[PDB]
Amino acid sequence: AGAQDFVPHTADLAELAAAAGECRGCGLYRDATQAVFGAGGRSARIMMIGEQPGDKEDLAGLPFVGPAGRLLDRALEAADIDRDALYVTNAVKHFKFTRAAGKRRIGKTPSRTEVVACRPWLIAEMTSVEPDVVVLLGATAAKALLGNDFRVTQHRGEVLHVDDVPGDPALVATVHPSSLLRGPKEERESAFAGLVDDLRVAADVR
Ligand code: SF4
Numbered sequence: 001a002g003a004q005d006f007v008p009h010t011a012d013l014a015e016l017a018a019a020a021g022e023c024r025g026c027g028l029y030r031d032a033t034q035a036v037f038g039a040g041g042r043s044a045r046i047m048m049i050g051e052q053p054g055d056k057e058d059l060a061g062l063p064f065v066g067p068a069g070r071l072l073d074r075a076l077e078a079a080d081i082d083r084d085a086l087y088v089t090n091a092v093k094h095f096k097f098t099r100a101a102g103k104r105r106i107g108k109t110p111s112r113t114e115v116v117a118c119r120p121w122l123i124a125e126m127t128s129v130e131p132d133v134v135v136l137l138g139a140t141a142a143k144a145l146l147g148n149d150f151r152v153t154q155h156r157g158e159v160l161h162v163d164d165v166p167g168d169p170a171l172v173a174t175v176h177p178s179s180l181l182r183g184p185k186e187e188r189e190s191a192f193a194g195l196v197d198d199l200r201v202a203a204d205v206r
Pocket residue numbers: 002003020023024025026027028029035092093094114117118119121
């Protein structure tokens with residue numbers, strides 16, 4: 001189902017990434033510029049998963065390059081997180097979007113079907129990196145591993161462990177960094193410190 005037959009039998013991230021460029025596991029490859037695979041090395045101890053590449057990522061060919069990526073980088077700073085320790089990816093690897101009437105590309109939420117279709121890449125990445133801890137950045141990513149009914153709001157910052165996940169890594173669900181780019185300054189400050197806390201929990205896993 002989905003991307004399964006497009007995934008090669010290798011843990012090599014370069015080769016996985018190249019194969020993802022050829023994926024037709026759902027419809028999203030058609031309109032997107034290219035696949036945006038994860039970034040980092042198989043030595044990474046912390047895997048971070050967002051929803052999908054955004055406008056800038058789709059064209060940069062790298063995850064977390066936009067304003068959300070800047071904000072996340074500021075949080076890793078405050079959490080004493082070393083980028084050498086990070087593998088960062090997204091639950092789906094092709095940007096799903098529409099053009100706004102007023103010409104910037106606006107991301108659209110991946111359907112559960114698209115998440116499940118792309119999940120074999122995520123499993124391949126998880127099997128390749130063998131992380132100690134996986135940070136789920138927002139509801140789409142968290143549901144991809146924790147179930148379609150999972151609520152980030154009720155469990156954020158808790159160390160979770162599900163038996164059906166490769167290598168039984170610890171799992172920490174947190175807010176989507178994009179959500180912290182909007183709202184009252186004092187609320188964004190509180191949300192940022194909560195993200196930092198969730199990141200410190202993950203970094204303190206072992
Ligand atoms: S979003 Fe994922 S499953 Fe769908 S075509 Fe792209 S790489 Fe394949």
